[PDB]
Scaffold this active site. Structure first.
Site: not given
Ligand SMILES: N=C(N)NCc1ccccc1CCCCCCCCCC(=O)N[C@H](CCCCN)C(=O)NO
Ligand SMILES: [Ca+2]
Ligand SMILES: [Ca+2]
Ligand SMILES: [Ca+2]
Ligand SMILES: [Zn+2]
Ligand SMILES: [Zn+2]
Ligand SMILES: [Zn+2]
Ligand SMILES: [Zn+2]
Length: 166
Positions: A25, A69, A97, A119-120, A123, A129
């Protein structure tokens, strides 16, 4: 903000990461740049340092995939789940991922890789969250064309409560 149970965190300020594969992309530079910026929003307010590896096993391995995956958390095609990361630790710990079934971009189109990845990585750093609709760690996506995106107050307090200021 919210921390993971047992307050999972890294036991070192210098972490490494590696981009395992890329999405079609966007350009490879775009992807690389998006992830670099994503990490910086966290390192800017803490003593945390990030360095990219060209080969080998890094603390945080980054990759794109569709459906199944390789782990027990398969994607669900277009929409829905956008990405998922593992909390701090060895192996999958910190790994991020991205669902390549979504259309990733570096603009207001599709889903902004930079924002989602920021954001990922939160974590991967030990943040769960947030219940604050104004925090980066809030479980819903929203675009922001804001120049020089800064980390919201809630996220800052949550990350510093784990690794201190910086
Ligand atoms: N108010 C707003 N929008 N602030 C955010 C916010 C503030 C400022 C700029 C961008 C955002 C959006 C960041 C990305 C939001 C991710 C929303 C979740 C989408 C669905 C998904 O992928 N969920 C999994 C759930 C699986 C967890 C179980 N292991 C997840 O957890 N992803 O991370
Ligand atoms: Ca999806
Ligand atoms: Ca890892
Ligand atoms: Ca895609
Ligand atoms: Zn490259
Ligand atoms: Zn190379
Ligand atoms: Zn996965
Ligand atoms: Zn999340």
């Amino acid at each position: 903000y919210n921390v993971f149970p047992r307050t999972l965190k890294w036991s070192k300020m210098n972490l490494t990461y590696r981009i395992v594969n890329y999405t079609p992309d966007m350009t490879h530079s775009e992807v690389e740049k998006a992830f670099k910026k994503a990490f910086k929003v966290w390192s800017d307010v803490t003593p945390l340092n990030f360095t990219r590896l060209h080969d080998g096993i890094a603390d945080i391995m980054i990759s794109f995939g569709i459906k199944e995956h390789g782990d027990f958390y398969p994607f669900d095609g277009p929409s829905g789940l956008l990405a998922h990361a593992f909390p701090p630790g060895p192996n999958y710990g910190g790994d991020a991922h991205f669902d390549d079934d979504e259309t990733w971009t570096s603009s207001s189109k599709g889903y902004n890789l930079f924002l989602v990845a920021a954001h990922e990585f939160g974590h991967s750093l030990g943040l769960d969250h947030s219940k604050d609709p104004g925090a980066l760690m809030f479980p819903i996506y929203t675009y922001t064309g804001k120049s020089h995106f800064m980390l919201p107050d809630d996220d800052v307090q949550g990350i510093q409560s784990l690794y201190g200021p910086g």
